[PDB]
Amino acid sequence: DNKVKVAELVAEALENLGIQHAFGIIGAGNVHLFEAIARRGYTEIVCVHHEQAACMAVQTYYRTNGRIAAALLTTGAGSTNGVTGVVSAWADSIPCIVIAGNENSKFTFPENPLRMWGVQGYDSCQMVERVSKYQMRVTKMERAVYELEKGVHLALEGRPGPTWIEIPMDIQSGRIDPATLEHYVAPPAPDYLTPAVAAQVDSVLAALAKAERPVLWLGNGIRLAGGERLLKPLLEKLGSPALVSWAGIDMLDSSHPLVFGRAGVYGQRAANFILQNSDYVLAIGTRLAIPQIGYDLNELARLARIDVVDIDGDEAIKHAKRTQENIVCDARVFIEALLARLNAADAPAIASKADWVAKCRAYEEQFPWVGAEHADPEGFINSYRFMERLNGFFKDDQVVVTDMGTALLSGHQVLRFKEGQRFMTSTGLGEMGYGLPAALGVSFANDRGEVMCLNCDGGMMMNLQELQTMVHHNLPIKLFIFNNDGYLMIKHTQKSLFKSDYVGTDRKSGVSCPDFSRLAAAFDIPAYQIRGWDECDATLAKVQAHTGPVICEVFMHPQQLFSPKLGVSPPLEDLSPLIPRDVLEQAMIGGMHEKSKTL
Template identity: 60%
Template sequence: MNEIIKVSDLIADFLIENEIKHVFGIIGAGNAHIFDSIQQKGYTEIICVHHEQAACMAMQTYYRTNGKVTAAILTTGAGSTNGITGVVSAWADSIPGIIISGNEHSKFVELHKDVRMWGVQGYDSPAMVEKVTKYAAKVSEANLVVYELEKAYSIAKHGRPGPCWIDIPMNLQSTNIKENEIIHFQLSDLPQLNLDADLNLLESIDLITDSIKKSKRPLFWFGNGIRLANAESLLEPLLEKYNIPALVTWAGIDSIDSNHPLVYGRAGTYGQRSANFILQNCDLLICIGTRMAISQIGYDINELAREADIAVVDIDKFELDKYKERYKYSVNADAGVFISKLLEKELNQSLDFSNWIQRCDKYREDYPWFNSEDHPDKDGFINSYQFMERLNPYLKWDQHITTDMGTALLSGHQVLRIGKDQRLMTSTGLGEMGYGLPAAIGASVARGKGEVLCLNCDGGMMMNLQELQTIVHYKLPIKLFIFNNDGYLMIKHTQNALFNGRRAGVDSNSGVSCPNFSALATAFGIPSFQIRTWEDFDVIIPQVQEVSGPVICEVFMHPYQLFVPKLGLAIQSDGSLISPPLEDLSPFISREELKKNMLNGLHPKSSNIEV
């Protein structure tokens, strides 16, 4: 029987066939048929947000939480342009997803193709996003809709993951076609990676294991590419086999238990001092599944782990080309395949790095992740780093955490200890304010509308404030902590450094103010708390953790609190500036102490810094 099927029903069937139980979006004229078909089918639930960028951000953490690719359903015109920030964010962090956008009637797409606007609101959305998606296409014929969706779904997951965008004119959505007219995508059309059978990979494994055997101070650096490869379960066996210390990137924090004895923290420009010392003193650095971002490696690749041979494993060969002159081994491979091969490799000798491990332990002991001297309370305000340290024991065994930028990102990623069954998710590529709350929505929906703790800030909250109604409507048990520091704290510090403290557009005195979030919580029907003192903390945190539904907890902190340790410029008495290497974090320690911690002495830049 050659059944007649409506195209929008085929789109809904595509979601069902791929077991996509939730999608995110906002309805409009350009996607009304899709919404109707999805609802009529009854399998997939549409989570209706209040801004399209939130749909594309929630799509990301939905995948990061349960490993299931989902979709954002956008309408034409501003409905699709609104989603682009979330799409670029997914592109930057290699998160797969499908964006299905509506567009004007095909006759206007063709008639107006050479003018700025098509029909009423239409424009060439695939052309706009083609540089920030793995695949972007405008469907021209009704019988190609399923083909393009299947192609996008396959490409999104293939190789280095990322978002794909399929634009479907509204008249095609409402068209009826015969079942035998439907064209399907063939998986055989995808390019074959064959990374696990690559002889170069096997040669690289031999070379790297030989280097490990010769090394005295080897170090692993684990990135989020490991989780994207579904290989996080291999990390503990890897450490057990090789007995090598490890660091994690910010995006890879939750890939392994922070309390594992061989996991020494998170290095970088806002890294932990102990982790940076370990990084800068290693003699072999093996980086797996990390794109070696500036915030991770510093501003000069030649100052990174200066005495070390560096091996980098990345599925994207263009990332390897970025610093190829510095890398001794560039391995174009899937992180999971690479780790599996390392585990299979016969070593034929015992590895003893006990002296190096003892030194790493000493760094961790001397420079703990949280140092009260660096993070004192001031002027009656509690310090956000102290807050994170005191929050650690209150985290539930399976706590899922999302963060926004600024205070939530910096103090959270430096201090929080993430256990084996806990998660910590944020935007590390684009780093957009406003990510935290939509991210919490995506993670909660992926957990069966389960609990998520969202660390946010007053400035970031204002970027997607409307999504409070989304969590209320769907009764999502999101615990929302809002750090109130009167505006944009990171930019205040930038202005201090660049403009002698002149302010513009960063706080209530220079053009930006935020509302009373407790009063706002009342308006949304959300219970709220305020923490101003440690006495408040001791009473309120247990209460917040016991609330079963949405809750807001506002945390008041100093409007000029410092974010330290950090890599910063050293201003000398003559006004000159020195940009130090990664081990020399601010606040600067004495040159004698720094020298004691560096096996090969001080870098010339550090020697010239006046402390």
């Protein structure tokens, strides 16, 4: 009897694929995979308390060190509970594979006329058909490992994303001669640097040499391409200021002489002025999503030509009405091809950008990230000022993950990072409850490493159960919670629209949150409280000095503003609270926009 259990071959395959961590919850649909993976001992199974957390953890697990993780779900609700995490990785272009069990293969076919498959199953491939790069149900034992190798390769190729491999129970418990195991041969990797693309790189180098006010917009597509180490020599060789997207903040030192912050609808005042006054914009690995460019392409950088570099052809041309060179290429290959042509024999002379770099620094001197608009409201701690203070307590290898709301906004608008530090969050989908599962992924990726989690009273509730997972494994997760009496982000939304009482956003309107210090005690978690500047520095030093999990509530004003912000619809440079008109006129090269004259 020379036959091996299919589940055992899958566990072996996972080792050969380098997958060292798997997140999920056990069930009858994958009890054979849990057994086989455990008995092999190579892949550690982290058991979560909601399958949604397993499909979110695998994301930041990969973003940490570049090793893919698997989510191990079971039949029925085990799979539907993970859909949210799949959609976030789909939207942030993060690779990861889901291995979901199901009923016996005799029930798993779409032609089934019944509402449900077997006892409690369903077509888990059809549900994520439009939010994952690949989905396959294994109906032959001999192709179980095949689809896992294929699922992993497709998750990592091109624009990364999640893949969904469903294996019915009976396929897991089956036995076959290991010799009959099929294996997936990945096709040859594409050569993006075609003669056409190579000519676009030439056109970009001619504009950079000629541009007097260039601005490079760098995005996480660079880090995903493994070319973040090429940014420091590129900017210094070009002498061109650079902006970073919220997702690619940690690719460069925020204090680098040519890095001038983040622009967008929630961008920094000096960053938006730099972007809107440029004469040439070169986006590399950034999606130029709506929160980055506003709501009107004709109002974006009204003095500049805009070139876009993106490995997704659909993303690269979505702004074609406004952009010129739409370069469909890998970010690393493009940067290397641009750095080569800078040393070519016929490399053009790069015109000086000194006057532009000086005007960029003037903008930052005129509009600091934490300005007067961020004054302590009625004595409360101002989140933006708290982020500036917390910044000084970052360790040399600090990893910061955030949820939505105050943590997201205040974090990405103030916090600075240097090489060795990382900043992560889910911005594509922007789902609440991503902070905690994000910290689990980073922690296990660094062998139970330290992680700082900036969270909110509202977002803490979506995956509140993962505190138990944090305690069970003694993860050194420093969890900051911003208390503001509910959904502060939505308070401003409905107050701008209706100018009436709050609805479903605070305790009076039907949304309340528990005392997280008292929950921390229940979970055996040390907890601190920062209500004012008096105990601020002494507390932050203790939180960073802890070796195990710790919670720290930060109390802010329940109606503190989020600023700077583009709000009601002026141009992108005219952020609220509006600056006096005579000052905006002087800050804009060709004068202010006609919309801003009567505001």
